[PDB]
Amino acid sequence: TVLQGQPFGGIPTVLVLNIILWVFVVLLYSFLRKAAWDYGRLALLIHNDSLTSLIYGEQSEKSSPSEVSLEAERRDRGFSSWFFNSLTMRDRDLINKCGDDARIYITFQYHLIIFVLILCIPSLGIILPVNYIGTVLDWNSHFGRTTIVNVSTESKFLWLHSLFAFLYFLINLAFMGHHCLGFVPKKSLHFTRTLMITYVPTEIQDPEIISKHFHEAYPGCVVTRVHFCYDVRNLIDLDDQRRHAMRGRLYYTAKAKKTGKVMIKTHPCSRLCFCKCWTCFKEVDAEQYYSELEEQLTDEFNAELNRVQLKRLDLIFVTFQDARTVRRIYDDYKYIHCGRHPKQSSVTTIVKNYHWRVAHAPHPKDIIWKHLSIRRFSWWTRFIAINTFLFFLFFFLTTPAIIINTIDIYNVTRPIEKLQSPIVTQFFPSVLLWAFTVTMPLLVYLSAFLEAHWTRSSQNLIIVHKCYIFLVFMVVILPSMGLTSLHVFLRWLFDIYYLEHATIRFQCVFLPDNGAFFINYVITAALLGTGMELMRLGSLCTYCTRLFLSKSEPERVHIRKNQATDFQFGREYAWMLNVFSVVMAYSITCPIIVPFGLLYLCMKHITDRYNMYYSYAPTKLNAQIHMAAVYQAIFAPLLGLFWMLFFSILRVGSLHSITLFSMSSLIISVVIAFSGVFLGKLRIAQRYE
């Protein structure tokens, strides 16, 4: 009696397909670097060529560089010189490239690679052999009796599975503790002499009033400076437009001085028509039009700056001489909502010190003057709305990855006629889900930019949190909660009716009747996605951006100024934590996803090390991102414990004593995760001053 269950799974077919994809993409890179010239290195050289003083250039001492950049970017030239004779690294190859941020990257990366290695010893040599010996399924089936389906209900081995899950959450906590023991994070919150104050009445146009209030409230306190904020979004836009016009004017002036006047067409649709008729599009001088537009933009910028003084916001900045009085101000002002009246002065009635909420002012570079205007308590209701919209869109978008698995026949009594083709049944949903996961962070970034929150530190934290949470949701739970579909509803009434069916039917998990979908996804995602990451996936973004506004030839030089894209650590941690979460979720269940998880980790390291040294422009990382990424890493096995609880309740029962360890660990695991989190904040507090 055979109706479903794919023998040997889709693993071999997707394996040959992804190795073909990998060799194809590596050949495509090589041919792009050999035929499209220095596409991926000239932009990097231009970006680091003193961008602070790139528009204007002066001949200084030793103008010709001493091959500092040439020495590094001259090793990988041959086609075969990409893998061997290239690392010689032994934990010291690239420490002095990006700073301490790159140092913590692989610090955690390895605390992962060796972590998944120490997982590959018992999860391949203990749980896999004892799950293979299960015989509740059919012997003839392969990859169906190697997963958690094969362990029988009436057996003392699901206890081993759950206990192993608990001890593996413990060992992951130990690994992350070893990682945290060597964080020694840089003190990002330097003792700032300037504070940020909100809700300040706009009628106090004199900073002397605020200075007098601070002096009277705090004896012995000196106010260095007082700063006020203004609506400068239009000012910023006008400045950007003027900068673009000025750069284009210089480019066209140089072109005119070199090869004479150049005639261009201002209309964007001129390039669309190949018509050479004079009446179709009027031709105007490039430099004259550029100068006129720049003059008009400068006049509008001057008018906006003149009107800026009238648009005073309620956010102010006060600078003090000593940070001790700043700490006193913060300690007095943090608990205002608790009913304590802070220190007052003679002009406090105008000041209204009971309204002010003062915290440590972020760095001005971290401060974006355009998006500090995003502050209201009409918040947290748009957030639920945008979150619901994104969740519904992602559900309706990932539904095809589930419905492509079709539905069994159950109509005629002769299933010998034909069966499903493994290619589109297994590889296609996997690659399609991979494409959706790859395109997800773009939409997540767009949503976060729409929200814009309060400060960019919180913005990056909410990115690295919400992108990860949506990804693990869409990749673990609802792809399986909706994969409980194809439910057997026929002569066999409930799940365990032996009426006209063998033990192949298992309502607990019958996703492709074995669970091969997720391992198929992880292997294809590994190989294809890191083939894309070798080509960096940012090339498609650049292509789309140029196709959006392909015009105004000096804009090509403008693009080349910022053609080199820096590291987007949010996306890379999103990928790593997504696959880590899915592996930890199905590690104990199906142990075949473990060695392929090792393959993903090792090959991801292989690609991003080369990216680090030759395609990832160095740039510092905020410590909060890593301090949250470790928290996601430790919280990931709660997904696996939740899946173990799910399998206890469905397959085993409710009051069965095992359902309770999964029931208990999930409780002990969450309480221990909270303990570890608040211990991490406590250690930060210790290593804060």
Author numbering: 26 to 714
Provide passages from the article that reported this PDB entry.
The TMEM63 family proteins (A, B, and C), calcium-permeable channels in animals that are preferentially activated by hypo-osmolality, have been implicated in various physiological functions. TMEM63s, together with its plant orthologues OSCAs, are members of a newly identified OSCA/TMEM63 cation channel family that are activated by mechanical forces of osmolality. TMEM63C is essential for maintaining the kidney filtration barrier integrity in zebrafish, and expresses low in chronic kidney disease patients.
Using single-particle cryo-EM, we determined the structure of TMEM63C at 3.56 Å resolution as a monomer. TMEM63C contains 11 transmembrane helices (TMs), TM0-TM10. The N-terminus is oriented towards the extracellular space, while the C-terminus faces the cytosol. Similar to OSCA, the ion-passing pore of TMEM63C is surrounded by TM3-7. Three bulky pore-facing residues (F542, F543 and Y546 on TM6), highly conserved among TMEM63 and OSCA, have been proposed to play critical roles in channel activities. The movement of TM6b may narrow the ion-passing pore of TMEM63C for calcium entrance. Additionally, we identified two non-protein densities within our cryo-EM map of TMEM63C, which are likely composed of lipids, and may contribute to the modulation of mechanosensitive ion channels gating.
